[PDB]
């Protein structure tokens, strides 16, 4: 909610479709009356089938896992089997059940046991060299967003735990000296942080617009963050503690280098997801209570006039 | 290398059990002796139905970006479908030349009524679950992982503007003071534990606070290193602070950053803090990167590398 | 009555569901009008299957408890027996009494080996899931919350130690002190919302600091409670401290504890705590309760109870 | 590892028997060899029942929840759909795979779909009143034990958050200065926390047993911490801060009372469970990175000897 | 959009033309519909040739290479078989795919000396030559040329150095001169003609030069702009000097560099200037890139930026 153009968290939705397309199949099925013992055993042999090709693919990871099990696995062999075919009990006991009811149940459709075997380790094996069963972007996106797998998260929580924590307490004291020893104006009480989300983030602020003016160094592990008044036509509407966020610089830098592969698109994504993620972390921390404000701005509008309707 | 926990990039022993697997595959289809004509029909239906069920994932997909369209992928449906199914034309294409076969190759709209009720139940219960190791290999070949991001990011803010004047401010503080020669390196700890005590003095005994190098202010320390009570060599030592960090988001709730998931991060962070320190300009030999993990005395490990 | 968010204890809601649903099930049997002693044989056939499938569920669970025998149960297997299946006797009768009309009521072994593989399947994937709303109930019904024990120590370390002594310390400082008399009762102030600022003024502006009890010494506040400027009244403010340890346990990833069994731990702290006082004989309504969840005026709200 | 009858973690072993029955189970209808058909349709229709009587169990449920709905859930129907029926959209999914295997599928034991309603709805009832499917203590215990719902756990984390935390930074430098100053042995670095299994906690820890004996009180909220020194035949072996920990008092306290319902094998098993929540903590927690031991123990036996053990 | 005469980065328009192109086959083989059986066999056929020549040049590529692999590819074969034969894999198996073909379908030794003997006269006498375009389009897809490594170069050394303190000391010499303040932008000109005079008071009399910016010697310049014989503005004009090296490079004889391939090339430089500048961040828009050819007035183009 800090600019339209952050992503918000993914939803239920593809459960919600994934609901109605199945309403859809069982109307359908009921409409055409074909008998539904043949339907039971062809659907639990066609998710039989899906689990054994899940653990041969298992099994060819397992084997270049098991040179990493000495590194990335604190050499243990059932971590490796459970991360190379997620539950171990529960996998073994659908692996069971399909052994049981591949070799037993009669199959129309399909091929014999250990044939059905063979032709599934050969699409197995042709899967695998040829790239076919790969992960859509959309896939990726969720399981990043889901389990935490970004740049972003990292970003925005070393933010947090390095800088503002340690900040932010100091920061109403210190305003509220500077507002009494000079008078002359008023100061708002709350440092508001700027999301340049093009990561265009230039080493002078005042040049962003010229109405943004440095005032006065606040006075005081050595923290110095100039203060800004904001000219409205000419005049000073107010002033305040005015920065920018240096891990969008961070992530431009990572975008200029070529030992990054970060692209422009991935560094647009990850600043809006940097954004969205500082907003949920200073939204439910302690030390952010009426303490500091996120202004998220792109560039297509001037600073000062966000500056001004947030103040 | 660095260590020998910290785990190398991965290698392709994928390809070589695919390709034991193809020979056996091979193998026991000639010895069986079947016609190929079945086959053939039968592995086209199969790789039809697995074209069906991934579109039917994409369709499910779009239907959940409906509402991301406008922010995700610029408000372009173009952007959204291409997200949602891969490549437009390369998918676009396989689908239809699988309808074909499918359709062409000898129930019609029941078996799509099944598949359809099959891949809803896949999505909805999630029976084809991705393999934390497949997750993991995924994550780090398209660099999504938090190391990744947390050590460029401690490149880019804090070692690439103190390492071309550290060796001044090393020599400026030689040509000042005597006995104790310090090194030219600086000694960045990478304690795979992450805890990080916040003073080495407090770590090891072994170890003694010496003084402050001279300074944005970056104030760095120089320690003394003991061993049975000499002074055996003085460094420049810092922790790595993403490591502490990766501390206190695992402390955290709002993170969901586990401890197996820290110090996973932690080898890939360090993996990839040597990586970006072997190539980069800023990085002469003047700062040597020390990886160790308590099952221990630090100062033995310091002057090991000294 | 302490406040409109936070749940009264459980009535008998269900108790009236199960009686709505037996008389509907009696008017539909009524109405097929179907043989009884059918239907007897099903029923009995059915809490056969139940009973056994039970049975080994608890069969599963002592095998899993065989090793926790020895701190569990003081190694005895009577007490793990009965931990695994219930009461001994009654459920071992049970079970008797259902495996010999199973046999004398008309396959015998193909339907237990049947029964059991879906016994495993139950166990194993975890399809008999626990209903949340089930899982408060119990939890309530048998004192298996945070917040219960939470208020109970809240009460017995802290309101016990000070309730009686707090008027005494007040009647002294009133006869100290001239004309308004402080309020002779405990306003704690019980935020729902978890965040407590260390002072007053932050939470509100027209709520000031300022004096300081005369005295293991409790440094009880007296606050001004400032109405349109002007001073109402003194009293005693003090917030509730477990509301800061559920806070501090919700911000953490070692507690298993997220927000929204913080606010449900919340409500709960706050009933239990004030049916403690209540009933509690050190308190003679010389503490009033004060809770209140943000959509507000604390002062309005405060002078309210005053 | 701290006493011998603190219960360890609850393992898979649970599962790895029931993989066993499972293997059991496929091994007997191998030998019986009857019709795979029919078994996979029981199961599928024992599956439907099972999921049928879960939805009458929620719907019973749903009809008290609903009362509390202003209240206890923050007044929206959907979060007490997903309280008394688990995930909406899986066990919508579910219950219409049951409706629908069970309106098609032909069963040769098994009545009708509206008799099997009916009777189905019977027997929940007749469980709902008489509490027929009684919960045996040790899936309660193992419930709650997963999800965090004893008042151990809170009160350990209470003890942590309130107490501990703040003082064991502290300590250390405080028993440092009390060791420059009074120089007559010297004390431990490591505050050590009395945890009595049997919940009997006098309020003077001298009067536990004559070999400990109250030494001095350590300087500075006051953190009035009492040292104490070991009589080991009749010489101070050692000497260090000791004190009891009060959550355990508390809980004694409560199981006095009558208005908690708090009894004696509970209180024992709570004590217990506090102890290893503290461990955990502890071992885990930043500030305790050293500086804390737990003396868990039970009289059936000398407290100093194993005090001084762990010295 | 730097100047209507620098041409844009290189499209697509060549798909749409094999597009129309496969159009009209299509059409006329739909309007033919001649038996597809003798059509797939000539095809393949002559794919299964293009392919046999290319491995001969390939070959004859090699034969060239056996003294380069000791020094273009540090003495390994496979790298330099790649060389010569492309993609070692996919290349390898269209190879073996189009013998395989060739063979199956039905003299064949003579074809095959008569394709050899076609390739011998095609590397001889350079049949298949590459026309320009086609160099030109692989030269700008690779990044293979000497205005890349010019502009780059540029960047690297002179205007990453001078940005930053351009602006301060203009902003210096602004509050340093009573009198029209000098703008705060190097106005970089990039004349295509590469005719660069040793001052611009020889490039044109309506513009004079004024001043030197205080100071590396970097010590630029400030002009003055007349209009109508008055001053309307300064600005720190400075010629870019990889322009003027481009003309010293076609000057002489070893560069092999051409006036056409100087213009190209110093189009091309202009270009990837300014997409450099676009992305440098050092560019705070405090240098604005202006070019211009007489096909002119210099004055009234530099005051048009302003
Ligand atoms: C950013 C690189 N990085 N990525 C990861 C992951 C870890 C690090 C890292 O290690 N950085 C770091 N370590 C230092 C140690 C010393 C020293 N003397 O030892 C000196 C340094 O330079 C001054 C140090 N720096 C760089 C500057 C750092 C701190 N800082 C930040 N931080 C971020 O923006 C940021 C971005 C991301 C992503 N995560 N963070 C939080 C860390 N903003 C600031 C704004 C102001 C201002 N408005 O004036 C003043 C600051 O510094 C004063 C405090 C100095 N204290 C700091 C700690 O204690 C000793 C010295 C600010
Ligand atoms: C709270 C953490 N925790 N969870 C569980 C479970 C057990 C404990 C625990 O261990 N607490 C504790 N033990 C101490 C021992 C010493 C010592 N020197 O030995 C010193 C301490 O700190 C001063 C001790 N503290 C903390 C301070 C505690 C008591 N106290 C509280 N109570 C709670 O907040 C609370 C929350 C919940 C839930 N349950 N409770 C009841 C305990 N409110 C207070 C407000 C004031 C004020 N502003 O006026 C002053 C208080 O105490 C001043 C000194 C009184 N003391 C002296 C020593 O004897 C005991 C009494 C207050
Ligand atoms: C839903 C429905 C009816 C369906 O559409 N298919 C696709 C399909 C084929 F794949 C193959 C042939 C026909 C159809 Cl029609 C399917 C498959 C099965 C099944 O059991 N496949 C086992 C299996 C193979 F068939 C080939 C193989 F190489 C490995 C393997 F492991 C069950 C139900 C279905
Ligand atoms: C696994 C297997 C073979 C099994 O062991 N039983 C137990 C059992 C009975 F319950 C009932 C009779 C015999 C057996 Cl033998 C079972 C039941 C069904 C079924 O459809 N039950 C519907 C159903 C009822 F019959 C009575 C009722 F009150 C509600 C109800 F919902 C399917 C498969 C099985």
């Not at 309403?23 to 054994?52: D, F, I, K, M, N």
């Not at 002359?184 to 040049?207: E, F, H, K, T």
Request: glycine share 6%.
């Amino acid at each position: 909610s800090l600019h339209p153009s952050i992503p918000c968290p993914r939803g239920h939705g593809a459960q919600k479709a994934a609901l109605v397309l199945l309403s859809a199949c069982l109307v359908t099925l009921w409409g055409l009356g074909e008998p539904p013992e043949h339907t039971l055993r062809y659907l639990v042999l066609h998710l039989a089938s899906l689990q054994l090709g899940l653990l041969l693919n298992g099994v060819c990871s397992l084997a270049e896992e098991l040179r990493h099990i000495h590194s990335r696995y604190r050499g243990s062999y059932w971590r490796t089997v459970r991360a190379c075919l997620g539950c171990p009990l529960r996998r073994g006991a659908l692996l069971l059940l399909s052994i049981y009811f591949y070799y037993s149940l009669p199959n129309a459709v399909g091929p014999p046991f250990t044939w059905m075997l063979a032709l599934l380790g050969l699409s197995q094996a042709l899967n695998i060299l040829l790239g076919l069963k790969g992960l859509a972007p959309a896939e990726i996106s969720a399981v990043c967003e889901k389990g935490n797998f970004n740049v972003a998260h990292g970003l925005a929580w070393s933010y947090y735990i390095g800088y503002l924590r340690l900040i932010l307490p100091e920061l109403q004291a210190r305003i509220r000296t500077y507002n009494q020893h000079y008078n002359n104006g008023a100061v708002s009480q709350r440092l508001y942080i700027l999301l340049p989300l093009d990561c265009g983030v230039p080493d002078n602020l005042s040049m962003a617009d010229p109405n943004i003016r440095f005032l006065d160094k606040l006075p005081q592990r050595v923290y110095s963050n100039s203060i800004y008044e904001l000219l409205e036509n000419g005049q000073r509407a107010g002033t305040c503690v005015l920065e920018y966020a240096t891990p969008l610089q961070t992530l431009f830098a990572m975008s200029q280098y070529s030992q990054a592969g970060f692209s422009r698109e991935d560094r647009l994504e990850q600043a809006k997801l940097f954004c969205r993620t500082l907003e949920d972390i200073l939204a439910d921390a302690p030390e952010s209570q009426n303490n500091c404000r996120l202004i998220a701005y792109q560039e297509p509008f001037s600073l000062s006039q966000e500056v001004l309707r947030h103040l």
